[PDB]
Amino acid sequence: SMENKIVASTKEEFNTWYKQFAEKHKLNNKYTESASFCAEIPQLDTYKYKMELASTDNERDAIYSSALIEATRFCAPIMECAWASCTGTVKRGLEWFDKNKDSDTVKVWDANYQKLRTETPPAEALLAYQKAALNWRKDVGFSIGEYTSILKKAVAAEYKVPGTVINNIKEMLSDMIRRRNRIIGREHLDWCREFASGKFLNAFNPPWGEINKAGKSGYPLLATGLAKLVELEGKDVMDKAKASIAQLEGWVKENKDQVDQDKAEDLLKGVRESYKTALALAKQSNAFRAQGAQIDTVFSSYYWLWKAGVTPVTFPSVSQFLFELGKNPKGQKKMQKALINTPLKWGKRLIELFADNDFTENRIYMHPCVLTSGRMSELGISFGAVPVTSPDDAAQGSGHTKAVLNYKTKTEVGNPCACIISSLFEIQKAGYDIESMDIVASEHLLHQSLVGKRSPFQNAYLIKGNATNINI
Numbered sequence: 463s464m465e466n467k468i469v470a471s472t473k474e475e476f477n478t479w480y481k482q483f484a485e486k487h488k489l490n491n492k493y494t495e496s497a498s499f500c501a502e503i504p505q506l507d508t509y510k511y512k513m514e515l516a517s518t519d520n521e522r523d524a525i526y527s528s529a530l531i532e533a534t535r536f537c538a539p540i541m542e543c544a545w546a547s548c549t550g551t552v553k554r555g556l557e558w559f560d561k562n563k564d565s566d567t568v569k570v571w572d573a574n575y576q577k578l579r580t581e582t583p584p585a586e587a588l589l590a591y592q593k594a595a596l597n598w599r600k601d602v603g604f605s606i607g608e609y610t611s612i613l614k615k616a617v618a619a620e621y622k623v624p625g626t627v628i629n630n631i632k633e634m635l636s637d638m639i640r641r642r643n644r645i646i647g648r649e650h651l652d653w654c655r656e657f658a659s660g661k662f663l664n665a666f667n668p669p670w671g672e673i674n675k676a677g678k679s680g681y682p683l684l685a686t687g688l689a690k691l692v693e694l695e696g697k698d699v700m701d702k703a704k705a706s707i708a709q710l711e712g713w714v715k716e717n718k719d720q721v722d723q724d725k726a727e728d729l730l731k732g733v734r735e736s737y738k739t740a741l742a743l744a745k746q747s748n749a750f751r752a753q754g755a756q757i758d759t760v761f762s763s764y765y766w767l768w769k770a771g772v773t774p775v776t777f778p779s780v781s782q783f784l785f786e787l788g789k790n791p792k793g794q795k796k797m798q799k800a801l802i803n804t805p806l807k808w809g810k811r812l813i814e815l816f817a818d819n820d821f822t823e824n825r826i827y828m829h830p831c832v833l834t835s836g837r838m839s840e841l842g843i844s845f846g847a848v849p850v851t852s853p854d855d856a857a858q859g860s861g862h863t864k865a866v867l868n869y870k871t872k873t874e875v876g877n878p879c880a881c882i883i884s885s886l887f888e889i890q891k892a893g894y895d896i897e898s899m900d901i902v903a904s905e906h907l908l909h910q911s912l913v914g915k916r917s918p919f920q921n922a923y924l925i926k927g928n929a930t931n932i933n934i
Contacts, residue, residue, distance in 0.1 A: 788860025
């Protein structure tokens with residue numbers, strides 16, 4: 463029969479289920495964050511040599527698919543993949559969109575889907591989508607632990623890798639930075655940075671004279687400074703800036719005997735108008751057109767099942783399909799063939815969520831709610847690592863890109879994560895031209911790592927700072 467064998471309406475029930483599954487299958491925490499089937503860190507070099515030899519494109523596609531599935535299939539985070547694929551999570555997760563379909567943080571991208579299959583979205587729908595992701599995650603009750611949670615935290619100053627891969631990791635980082643810069647004062651900027659975090663009393667003594675003083679742009683100096691800040695150091699600055707204003711206010715309230723009321727209230731007014739201007743400038747930053755479009759995998763996955771008309775009953779067959787897909791990969795053509803050929807009804811309805819082929823602008827600007835053939839992997843890691851009609855078959859392994867994130871980054875085992883990311887990167891270099899690719903998947907895996915992301919089921923959006931500023 464086609465049924466969901468993982469039956470839990472609550473984190474507790476699932477916990478029981480998974481203690482049992484984990485013990486039966488000897489899930490192991492050696493090299494992976496979450497317990498998994500991973501006994502040994504894969505060796506991808508043979509794919510590197512083979513890839514050095516390949517004279518045709520199809521072969522390079524197959525060699526990279528192979529390399530990927532080889533590095534992935536046994537490292538999937540069984541606990542979170544399972545939890546995300548269980549009965550309760552599937553019921554609530556699908557039911558969320560029926561209640562929230564018409565809300566203002568959903569309707570913006572949803573009702574506009576067909577359009578989004580072609581043209582890049584405004585900033586508004588990016589913000590909306592991210593809010594909706596966090597909301598679905600709160601309402602559904604998706605967090606059973608740190609690997610399913612919302613990550614709010616500062617990007618670590620340093621990223622440790624072993625001397626074997628340090629070369630590679632660095633090359634990747636430089637190409638990444640080059641790419642970010644491609645996506646897009648002196649005293650003023652440092653005064654703005656100091657104000658944004660440490661010194662809010664700096665607002666009493668602006669370097670340019672009056673705090674709200676306009677520059678060559680007619681835009682306030684503070685505003686553009688903060689903007690350039692969000693650009694270089696990441697949007698965290700804005701929050702920090704606001705925090706500082708908070709302090710300012712607090713101070714003005716705690717000691718009001720030291721200040722003149724009228725011009726204190728005008729000071730505050732000023733900093734606030736400047737901050738609103740800085741926000742507005744950063745929302746259109748065009749660097750927000752990218753970072754805003756960062757996908758929330760499980761959320762977009764459930765959105766896709768919903769949009770494709772999937773339900774608790776038919777979900778197990780999708781889980782099944784995905785599971786097979788993690789064994790026998792399919793490029794564009796093969797995916798389309800498979801999806802149209804299946805007698806099952808969600809197959810055709812999936813490809814009708816696919817964007818155009820044939821999508822004009824750069825794809826990092828594509829909205830995170832839109833399905834494509836390359837994005838099947840998201841579903842792949844959500845519902846596919848563990849087939850829910852036959853959970854034990856998970857022991858065979860199902861390769862899905864984000865599986866890489868389940869690898870530990872810690873130095874005692876010698877950062878398997880970075881090692882695999884690096885092997886993938888070399889392998890790609892061999893057969894493909896790096897600089898000329900719209901996206902580089904190993905690079906995005908790396909981006910996810912540097913930013914402190916240990917799971918596919920973690921939400922990385924609210925993280926503090928820019929991964930490109932990291933020292934490795």
